[PDB]
Amino acid sequence: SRIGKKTIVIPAGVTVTLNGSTATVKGPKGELVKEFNPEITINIEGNEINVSRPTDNKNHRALHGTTRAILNNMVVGVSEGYEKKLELIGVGYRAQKQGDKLVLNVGYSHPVEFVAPKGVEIEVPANTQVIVKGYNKEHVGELAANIRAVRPPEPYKGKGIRYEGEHVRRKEGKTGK
Amino acid sequence: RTTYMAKPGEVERKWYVIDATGVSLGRLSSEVASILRGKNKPQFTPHIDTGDFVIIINAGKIGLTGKKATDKIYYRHSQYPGGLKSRTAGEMRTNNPEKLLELSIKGMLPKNSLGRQLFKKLHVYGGSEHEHAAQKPEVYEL
Amino acid sequence: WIARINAAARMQDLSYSKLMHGLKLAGIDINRKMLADLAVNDIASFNTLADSAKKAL
Amino acid sequence: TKGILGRKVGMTQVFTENGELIPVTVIEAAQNVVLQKKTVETDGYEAVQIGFEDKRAKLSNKPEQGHVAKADTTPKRFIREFRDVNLDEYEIGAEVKVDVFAEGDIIDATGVSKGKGFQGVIKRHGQSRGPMAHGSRYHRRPGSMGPVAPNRVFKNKLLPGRMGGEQITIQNLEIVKVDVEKNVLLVKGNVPGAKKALVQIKTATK
Amino acid sequence: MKVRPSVKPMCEKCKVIRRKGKVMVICENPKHKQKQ
RNA sequence: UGGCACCUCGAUGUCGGCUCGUCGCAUCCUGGGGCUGUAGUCGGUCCCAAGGGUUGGGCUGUUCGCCCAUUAAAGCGGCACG
RNA sequence: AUAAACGCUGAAAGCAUCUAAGCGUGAAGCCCCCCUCAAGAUGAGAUUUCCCAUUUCUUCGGAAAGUAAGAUCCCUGAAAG
Numbered sequence: 026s027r028i029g030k031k032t033i034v035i036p037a038g039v040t041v042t043l044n045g046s047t048a049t050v051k052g053p054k055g056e057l058v059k060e061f062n063p064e065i066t067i068n069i070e071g072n073e074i075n076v077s078r079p080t081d082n083k084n085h086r087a088l089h090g091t092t093r094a095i096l097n098n099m100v101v102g103v104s105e106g107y108e109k110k111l112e113l114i115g116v117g118y119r120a121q122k123q124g125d126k127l128v129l130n131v132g133y134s135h136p137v138e139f140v141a142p143k144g145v146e147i148e149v150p151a152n153t154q155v156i157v158k159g160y161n162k163e164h165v166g167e168l169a170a171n172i173r174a175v176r177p178p179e180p181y182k183g184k185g186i187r188y189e190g191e192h193v194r195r196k197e198g199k200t201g202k
Numbered sequence: 203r204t205t206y207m208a209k210p211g212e213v214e215r216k217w218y219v220i221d222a223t224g225v226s227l228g229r230l231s232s233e234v235a236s237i238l239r240g241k242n243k244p245q246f247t248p249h250i251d252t253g254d255f256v257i258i259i260n261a262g263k264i265g266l267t268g269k270k271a272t273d274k275i276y277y278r279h280s281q282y283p284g285g286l287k288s289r290t291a292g293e294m295r296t297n298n299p300e301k302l303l304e305l306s307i308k309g310m311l312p313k314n315s316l317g318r319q320l321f322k323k324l325h326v327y328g329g330s331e332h333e334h335a336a337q338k339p340e341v342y343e344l
Numbered sequence: 345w346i347a348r349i350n351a352a353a354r355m356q357d358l359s360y361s362k363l364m365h366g367l368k369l370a371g372i373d374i375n376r377k378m379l380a381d382l383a384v385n386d387i388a389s390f391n392t393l394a395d396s397a398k399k400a401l
Numbered sequence: 402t403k404g405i406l407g408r409k410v411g412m413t414q415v416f417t418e419n420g421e422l423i424p425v426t427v428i429e430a431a432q433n434v435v436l437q438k439k440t441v442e443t444d445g446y447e448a449v450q451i452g453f454e455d456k457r458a459k460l461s462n463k464p465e466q467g468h469v470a471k472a473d474t475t476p477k478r479f480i481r482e483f484r485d486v487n488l489d490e491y492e493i494g495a496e497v498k499v500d501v502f503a504e505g506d507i508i509d510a511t512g513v514s515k516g517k518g519f520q521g522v523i524k525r526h527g528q529s530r531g532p533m534a535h536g537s538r539y540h541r542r543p544g545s546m547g548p549v550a551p552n553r554v555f556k557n558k559l560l561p562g563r564m565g566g567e568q569i570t571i572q573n574l575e576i577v578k579v580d581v582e583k584n585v586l587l588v589k590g591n592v593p594g595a596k597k598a599l600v601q602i603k604t605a606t607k
Numbered sequence: 608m609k610v611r612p613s614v615k616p617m618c619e620k621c622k623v624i625r626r627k628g629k630v631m632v633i634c635e636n637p638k639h640k641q642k643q
Numbered sequence: 644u645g646g647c648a649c650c651u652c653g654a655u656g657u658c659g660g661c662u663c664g665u666c667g668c669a670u671c672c673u674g675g676g677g678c679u680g681u682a683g684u685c686g687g688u689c690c691c692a693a694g695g696g697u698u699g700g701g702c703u704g705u706u707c708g709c710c711c712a713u714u715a716a717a718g719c720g721g722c723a724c725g
Numbered sequence: 726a727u728a729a730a731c732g733c734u735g736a737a738a739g740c741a742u743c744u745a746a747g748c749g750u751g752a753a754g755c756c757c758c759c760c761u762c763a764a765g766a767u768g769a770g771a772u773u774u775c776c777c778a779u780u781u782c783u784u785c786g787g788a789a790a791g792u793a794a795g796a797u798c799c800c801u802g803a804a805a806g
């Protein structure tokens with residue numbers, strides 16, 4: 026595992042501690058705690074974290090790599106944070122918010138309501154632009170996916186809710202003549 | 203001619219506590235059934251009950267290997283047309299560990315009056331405490 | 345008889361099969377009936393014979 | 402969630418404010434008293450026990466007098482338990498009146514149905530009868546008992562037997578009128594049982 | 608989706624993967640989605 | 644549809660209907676989904692799914708079938724052709 | 726809580742990947758919610774209340790003979806049969 030061997034440089038202001046297999050990370054933006062399997066081990070010093078691999082067989086290699094990746098994302102999210110962006114395409118498609126509640130008018134007979142969970146926030150720069158922010162990769166990704174699943178893009182006009190980094194496969198409504 | 207046969211109530215029966223943490227269901231079941239039958243004593247008599255009493259604690263932490271938690275099934279029939287019911291081993295371990303242990307132990311005891319008598323000497327608890335401190339049970343290692 | 349001898353020998357850190365093989369190796373010709381009788385009634389002589397078999401192995 | 406016990410008096414009709422005409426059942430519910438409260442730390446579950454109708458001292462025995470003497474009341478003909486209630490109400494020895502219900506409430510009515518004796522399949526189970534002519538000799542009989550292969554007949558093959566006298570619950574009945582002075586409750590519709598039968602009136606569970 | 612015993616690529620962008628113990632083909636063309 | 648002749652010839656009642664059903668799923672309707680020669684409407688095909696439901700007549704001993712009028716739909720098979 | 730399915734995070738395989746560790750949506754179906762039976766559930770459960778420690782024989786075991794609380798025989802019946 027090239028990933029598993031890489032070093033984690035701890036930024037200033039964030040602290041990492043180990044309670045057995047459990048790991049806790051604190052910093053300016055929040056606190057994370059997570060459990061890993063005991064077969065992998067972690068060293069601790071002032072500003073480097075190294076996860077080591079006792080064995081060279083398959084599952085052990087995969088677990089080494091994923092443990093390093095999870096630690097990296099956890100520390101980065103505590104330190105700088107994470108965000109995702111969403112666009113709305115279509116006539117009458119509108120995004121708004123009332124307090125801590127996102128209201129979407131996406132062509133149904135009723136508006137669609139969203140409330141963010143703890144640690145995650147929703148921001149609306151414009152009526153057709155949504156931003157999900159938080160210090161946890163999984164939760165930000167899950168909430169953005171849940172929002173996008175309300176009205177995914179469609180291939181005949183492009184209407185719907187999509188990421189900026191999406192390429193929609195486009196089709197033609199009438200062909201042959 | 204001259205061979206020893208034990209009489210009812212003659213051989214003194216003991217109380218044991220066995221911890222079920224991390225042991226496979228079948229391995230523990232085999233040992234416990236052998237203890238209940240009375241096959242660890244030289245006074246074993248096939249038509250007399252000479253075994254001991256067994257308490258099992260932490261039955262919620264019995265082990266299942268492979269995909270037995272989701273793929274092993276227990277069935278019941280009520281004797282009504284179409285009345286078959288199905289239940290997986292893992293969610294019994296979550297909900298009724300005592301039933302799981304009792305079914306496994308019962309399957310490997312003799313099928314007669316004496317076997318039904320021996321089934322009554324087994325007590326199973328899903329937590330770590332039992333109600334039989336007055337019987338002064340003793341720790342037994344598999 | 346075999347089941348009773350097995351139970352008696354397991355308390356001496358043996359099996360029935362190992363004990364019987366050892367008693368064969370030592371030239372001892374006591375049959376199952378006498379061994380089980382001795383196990384139930386006179387366990388000290390049973391332990392003596394088990395030590396003899398154990399040394400034979 | 403409220404509850405009360407009563408006797409079925411009869412069956413009649415009333416005219417509503419609009420001039421409508423609806424059928425009602427009359428329930429008379431005098432002399433209800435709280436007798437006991439069951440709590441989790443003593444019984445395993447929470448309930449309130451209610452006694453309904455006064456009866457003569459000749460018709461009771463020492464255990465009954467002992468049980469009702471804790472609530473300072475005379476022996477009762479009927480006693481039932483109500484669950485899913487609030488035990489912070491219901492003082493021991495208190496009275497329960499038809500005031501607990503108001504016009505427009507929706508209730509559940511529990512009773513024991515009228516008794517029919519030994520009955521056949523087409524009345525007991527709503528079976529279909531055979532031809533009455535065209536040479537037939539098959540009129541009010543149960544039908545085939547089953548196929549040949551099992552060498553036996555299955556369970557739930559419906560046959561004649563005793564018909565009525567079962568516990569029945571009817572849901573979502575409306576209260577039309579409450580008369581406190583007469584201790585009378587008027588319920589739209591009908592309830593199980595014959596006249597003078599015991600009826601439980603409870604708040605609807607759905 | 609096409610459910611067949613004979614899952615194999617249909618163009619040069621099809622890719623053969625395994626998920627949950629099943630062999631399958633993913634592609635940009637949705638007509639090429641196959642599961643065994 | 645056949646082949647064989649293994650139980651039953653000191654008897655294992657044989658078609659259709661009626662009464663009463665129960666089970667399988669290779670699903671007729673209803674529920675969830677992928678692909679479409681999927682713009683919409685109306686459809687096609689495949690995957691999951693057996694919880695419930697699945698019509699009254701004319702002709703013929705008929706099973707089947709044709710026809711009339713409906714229905715969300717008028718499934719196919721096993722049980723000594725139950 | 727799941728099926729088919731759609732995803733997030735993510736390595737093995739510095740990328741990519743719905744999968745391997747870990748998460749989320751998701752069916753008239755499963756387990757509940759609703760109605761009825763149910764402790765002979767010989768594993769015979771729980772709560773409240775009532776009566777009490779009598780007299781003869783026995784060699785202990787135990788036996789019998791008057792009762793208490795409570796029920797029945799018998800009789801008038803139906804809302805039951």
Ligand SMILES: [Mg+2]
Pocket residue numbers: 275276
């Ligand atoms: Mg089994």
Ligand SMILES: [Mg+2]
Pocket residue numbers: 516517518
């Ligand atoms: Mg009657």
Ligand SMILES: [Mg+2]
Pocket residue numbers: 517518519806
């Ligand atoms: Mg009658």
Ligand SMILES: [Mg+2]
Pocket residue numbers: 537538
């Ligand atoms: Mg006639």
Ligand SMILES: [Mg+2]
Pocket residue numbers: 653
């Ligand atoms: Mg003959």
Ligand SMILES: [Mg+2]
Pocket residue numbers: 701
């Ligand atoms: Mg006709």
Ligand SMILES: [Mg+2]
Pocket residue numbers: 714
């Ligand atoms: Mg129609």
Ligand SMILES: [Mg+2]
Pocket residue numbers: 721724
């Ligand atoms: Mg057939």
Ligand SMILES: [Zn+2]
Pocket residue numbers: 617618619620621634635636639
């Ligand atoms: Zn392709």
